[PDB]
Amino acid sequence: RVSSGRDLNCVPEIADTLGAVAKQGFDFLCMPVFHPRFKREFIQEPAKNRPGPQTRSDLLLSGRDWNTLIVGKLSPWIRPDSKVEKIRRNSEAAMLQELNFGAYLGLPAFLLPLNQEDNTNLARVLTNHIHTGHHSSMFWMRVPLVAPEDLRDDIIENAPTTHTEEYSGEEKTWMWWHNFRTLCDYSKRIAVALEIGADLPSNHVIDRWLGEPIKAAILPTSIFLTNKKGFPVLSKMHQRLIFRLLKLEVQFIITGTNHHSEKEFCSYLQYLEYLSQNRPPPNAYELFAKGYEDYLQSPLQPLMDNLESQTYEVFEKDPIKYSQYQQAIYKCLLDRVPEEEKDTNVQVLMVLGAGRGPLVNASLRAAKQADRRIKLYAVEKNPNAVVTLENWQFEEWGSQVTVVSSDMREWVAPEKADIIVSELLGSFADNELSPECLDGAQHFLKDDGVSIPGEYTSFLAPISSSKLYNEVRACREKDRDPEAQFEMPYVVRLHNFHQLSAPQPCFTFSHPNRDPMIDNNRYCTLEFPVEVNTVLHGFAGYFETVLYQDITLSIRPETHSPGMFSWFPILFPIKQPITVREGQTICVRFWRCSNSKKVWYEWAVTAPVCSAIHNPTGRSYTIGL
Amino acid sequence: EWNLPPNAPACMERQLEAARYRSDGALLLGASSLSGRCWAGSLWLFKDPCAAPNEGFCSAGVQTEAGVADLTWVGERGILVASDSGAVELWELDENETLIVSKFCKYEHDDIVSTVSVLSSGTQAVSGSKDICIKVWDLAQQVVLSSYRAHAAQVTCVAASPHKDSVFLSCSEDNRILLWDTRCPKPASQIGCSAPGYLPTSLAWHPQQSEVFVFGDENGTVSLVDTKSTSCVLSSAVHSQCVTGLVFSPHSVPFLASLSEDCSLAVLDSSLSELFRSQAHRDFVRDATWSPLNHSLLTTVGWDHQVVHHVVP
């Protein structure tokens, strides 16, 4: 089901109007709070002293109704950026008056237009209102995909519509919004009400709004085509945009009069409901990740902290990660012990980081599938999980599994291993210190022993998202660096964002590592070709891993494993947003650093402009050894 | 409350929007309720011009669904209304002229209709809206013949030429005054002074020269424009605030009535020099209509609910 509202600029009776739109099936109404034509004077007499009332009464609706059903509209005559000083002054005061009245009423949202380039003073007055008193109203900016000047009929003899195409010119509307929200310093209270037109612009200038805070999409009745039975429908390319907007989850707003008088008004809405009912249903991934959209999670300390029972519980439900592990062990057993040896050669298998034991079970399922015999060690450093393991081995596993309660870097092994199995991977592959762990444990792997996984590679892509940039900014805490939020990676189901270039490999690790001098430190330079105008807010991290041969796991979107919810992307943010033009190259630099006690990342952008080196020394974020 | 005839409402809303003298001397009133519980409008006829705004001594009256942003006479019994509801509606007067009855109500604009003008023939009219469109109407057939999206901002004023059925002016907040001629494939032509100044707010054709017109801007300046010159002839800073209307006298050499949001009336000659000024209003002055019977008598209405009759030298 869709959430939708009716836009109106004419309300004779608030009681009757709200009833009609409710019966039509709308969830809410966009209406004026003062009469649109009721121009008020604030400075010079006698119009200044106009007998009240200034507008109608709050008593006309219940508190609940004001809070949930009404979206306010700024009066169309209010022009804070007028060239006329007197009009400037009155509009300043009138805007405050209407805004204060919305706050007074407890309106959940309030609509203000961006219908020209210069909105500086409008921005100032709104910023001033945001920082005056205590209120939580959302401010929706009404901004069109295509500017009114670029949509006008080519019917002025002496002023033709400049026929020569402009890539940047058709993007002017985004720059109206970008400038506004920059002046207002990315207030979390200012969102977008995107107006859709009959002529959808070129596909790029639509892309532009990818990753901006869109809360509503305004659909004028005039853009609706009419079918064989006289019902309102939309073009194929309009349906495309609607489905993209539904995936993002926004509210829809029908504006304009009913242009199909043969049927009712609920028909426009019936179609949107029809379109929403006709989307593909959520996949296995989207059912488990359903409520995680753009929710930033602080980096886990894999070695310093212990995972909660309920954490193990959730991930153990992954429909693919464990069967992929089973198959990797299945293929490795066959390759290591030939048919004539199926009863004589018993393979020694070590699960390093055994958790509550699902990989141990996977190893058992693999051996009885390959018809080969194995001896299992189950090493786990989390003493609380060790509890689950030892109850399992007593009730079920038997002496085939030897549970070891220690750190793998410390464990003095009684015998060397044929195969070491481990799942020590974070969202950026090596961010839970899997390299360091398997390095301290490889001394008890046989000289010809296999490590599962065999290797892993991290990936980076540059992203645009004012939504996520604001979320990171809001992570500022007391009693630390006021900018530390920006100098650590976040695990997040990225949703309201725009990927600016294809993912490229970052860091790679192979196991075992027979390198004479073992060094896990890294320095990598990546160049990202960008082919749109945009603002850089950070870098999405993904990973791929080779378990065994061709058996793999991936969260890289191109090669993602179906149904695998176990890992979300990581987000590396940057202190300051960086402007990027069409045709430019984003150059980033990532270092993996370490000492005896901790491992951390440091990153910097070097093109088109430089950023400050982020997280120098691990001052804001490290992972403890 | 002397009478108030059948169908006529008991009360008239505070904000007087329009006043128009009929040829026979009767006075048409348009009004809106721009505050309070109900945001509606009403239409009134006063055969006794001195009786207005008193609802008691009126000839006819009716309630419209929404506010009246603009209106005009259609011949002698027709009333054409620009409505808040987006509708353009025609009200036909009674044969006894005691009832005002709806003829058509067509919801064609997507926003408030702010301006209407009847074309010379009297069979067709042009409407302008906040939805940025301008529409051409067949009054007998009750349909839109042509819809034009020439402007880039809301349409402020549309004024039909005195004698040519295909020519009209229009101005918008996109800073464009457009001279129209629907005989051309590209009907609109951008007309101004030299350098683009303050937004045009009001337009009036010369009642005798179908080639000259006046426009008031939002800064209170009134200017005289020749179409065949494309040069701004004469200009004067008449008002301290936005000029909302301009109405020529029915005189041989016509005087120009000029109304403003500074709550004052001005009457200017052909060279735009000040002859008369009235501060009789305490709120916005909304319309001016010259008496057909007495050509030195001028009636103004305002949001102060005052109907004022002026004597002009």
Ligand SMILES: O=C(NC[C@H](O)CN1CCc2ccccc2C1)c1ccnc(NC2CCC2)c1
């Ligand atoms: O990517 C995530 N965390 C980073 C960890 O490195 C993920 N792994 C997944 C496999 C696993 C298995 C056992 C114990 C811990 C982990 C952590 C993450 C965080 C929060 N929710 C996630 N997915 C939701 C669980 C239902 C969807 C994933």
Ligand SMILES: Nc1ncnc2c1ncn2[C@@H]1O[C@H](C[C@@H](N)CC[C@H](N)C(=O)O)[C@@H](O)[C@H]1O
């Ligand atoms: N250095 C270490 N030595 C021993 N165990 C570790 C070490 N580092 C991490 N672990 C454990 O390895 C496990 C990693 C988990 N992601 C995997 C759990 C389990 N094998 C599963 O797939 O459900 C956690 O239970 C950690 O407590």
